[PDB]
Amino acid sequence: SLLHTFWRLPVAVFFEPHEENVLRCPERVLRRLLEDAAVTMRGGD
Amino acid sequence: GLFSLDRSYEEVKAAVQQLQTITFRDATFTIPDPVIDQHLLIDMKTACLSMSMVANLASELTMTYVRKLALEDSSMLLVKCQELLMRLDRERVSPDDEIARLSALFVMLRQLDDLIREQVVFTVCDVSPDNKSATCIFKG
Amino acid sequence: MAAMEANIFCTFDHKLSIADVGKLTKLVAAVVPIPQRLHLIKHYQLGLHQFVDHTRGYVRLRGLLRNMTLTLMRRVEGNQILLHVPTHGLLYTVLNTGPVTWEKGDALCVLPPLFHGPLARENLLTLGQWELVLPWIVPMPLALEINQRLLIMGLFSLDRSYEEVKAAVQQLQTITFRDATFTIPDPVIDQHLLIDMKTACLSMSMVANLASELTMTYVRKLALEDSSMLLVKCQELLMRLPARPQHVSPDDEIARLSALFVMLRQLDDLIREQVVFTVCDVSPDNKSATCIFKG
For residues B111 and B46, is the Cβ–Cβ distance under 8 A? yes
DSSP symbols for C149-201: HHHHHHHHHTTS-HHHHHHHHHHHTEEEETTEEEE-S-----HHHHHHHHHHH
User: What is the C-alpha to C-alpha distance for residues C144 and C132, in angstroms, rounded to an integer?
Assistant: 26
State which H helix or E strand residue B28 sits in: none
Determine whether the interchain pair B55/C216 forms a contact, defined as Cβ–Cβ distance below 8 Å: yes
User: What is the C-alpha to C-alpha distance for residues C192 and C244, in angstroms, rounded to an integer?
Assistant: 48
For residues C35 and C47, is the Cβ–Cβ distance under 8 A? no
User: What is the C-alpha to C-alpha distance for residues C234 and C256, in angstroms, rounded to an integer?
Assistant: 24
User: What is the C-alpha to C-alpha distance for residues C265 and B117, in angstroms, rounded to an integer?
Assistant: 8
Residues of B in contact with C229 (CB under 8 A): none
Distances in Å between the Cα of B41 and the Cα atoms of B20, B35, B45, B111, C193 are 17, 7, 6, 16, 40
Q: Which residues contact C146 (CB under 8 A, 6 or more apart)?
A: C111, C114, C175, C184
User: How far off is chain C from B1, nearest CA to CA, in Å?
Assistant: 10
- C160, amino acid identity: R
* Paired residues of C175 in beta bridges: C182
Three-state SS sequence of C106-140: CEEEEECCCECCCCCCCCCCCECCECCCCCEEEEH
Length of chain C: 295
Determine whether the interchain pair B48/C218 forms a contact, defined as Cβ–Cβ distance below 8 Å: yes
User: How far off is chain B from C97, nearest CA to CA, in Å?
Assistant: 26
For residues C132 and C294, is the Cβ–Cβ distance under 8 A? no
DSSP symbols for B38-91: TEE-HHHHHHHHHHHHHHHHHHHHHHHHHHHHTTT-SS-HHHHHHHHHHHHHHH
For residues C71 and C8, is the Cβ–Cβ distance under 8 A? yes
The closest CB to that of A11, out of B76, B86, B87, belongs to: B76
**Resolution, expressed in angstroms to one decimal:** 3.5
Beta-sheet pairing, B35-36 with B39-40: antiparallel
Q: Dihedrals φ, ψ of C72, to 5°?
A: -110, 155
What angle in degrees, to the nearest 10, is found between the helix axes of C213-222 and B42-69? Answer: 120
User: How far off is chain B from A14, nearest CA to CA, in Å?
Assistant: 8
User: What is the C-alpha to C-alpha distance for residues B103 and B99, in angstroms, rounded to an integer?
Assistant: 6
Q: Give the residue from chain B lying closest to C165, CA to CA.
A: B95
Q: Is B135 helix (H, G, I), strand (E, B) or coil?
A: strand
User: How far off is chain C from B11, nearest CA to CA, in Å?
Assistant: 7
Determine whether the interchain pair C202/B77 forms a contact, defined as Cβ–Cβ distance below 8 Å: yes
CB atoms within 10 A of CB C199: 15
Determine whether the interchain pair B117/C265 forms a contact, defined as Cβ–Cβ distance below 8 Å: yes
User: How far off is chain C from B34, nearest CA to CA, in Å?
Assistant: 16
Determine whether the interchain pair B49/C264 forms a contact, defined as Cβ–Cβ distance below 8 Å: no
User: What is the C-alpha to C-alpha distance for residues C208 and B60, in angstroms, rounded to an integer?
Assistant: 8
- Supply angle C-alpha C32, C37, C42, rounded to 5: 70
The closest CB to that of A8, out of B74, B76, B86, belongs to: B86
Tell me whether C166 touches chain B (CB under 8 Å): no
What angle in degrees, to the nearest 10, is found between the helix axes of C229-237 and B42-69? Answer: 10
* Paired residues of B108 in beta bridges: none
Residues 26-85 in B contacting C (C-alpha not used; CB under 8 Å)? 46, 48-49, 51-62, 64-66, 68-69, 73, 75, 77-78, 81-82, 84-85
* Paired residues of C7 in beta bridges: C84
Q: Which residues contact B35 (CB under 8 A, 6 or more apart)?
A: B1, B4, B7
Task: Identify the CA nearest to C181 among candidates C142, C140, C133.
Answer: C142
Residues of B in contact with A11 (CB under 8 A): 76, 79-80
For residues C156 and C165, is the Cβ–Cβ distance under 8 A? yes
Q: Give the residue from chain C lying closest to B13, CA to CA.
A: C248
Tell me whether B83 touches chain A (CB under 8 Å): yes
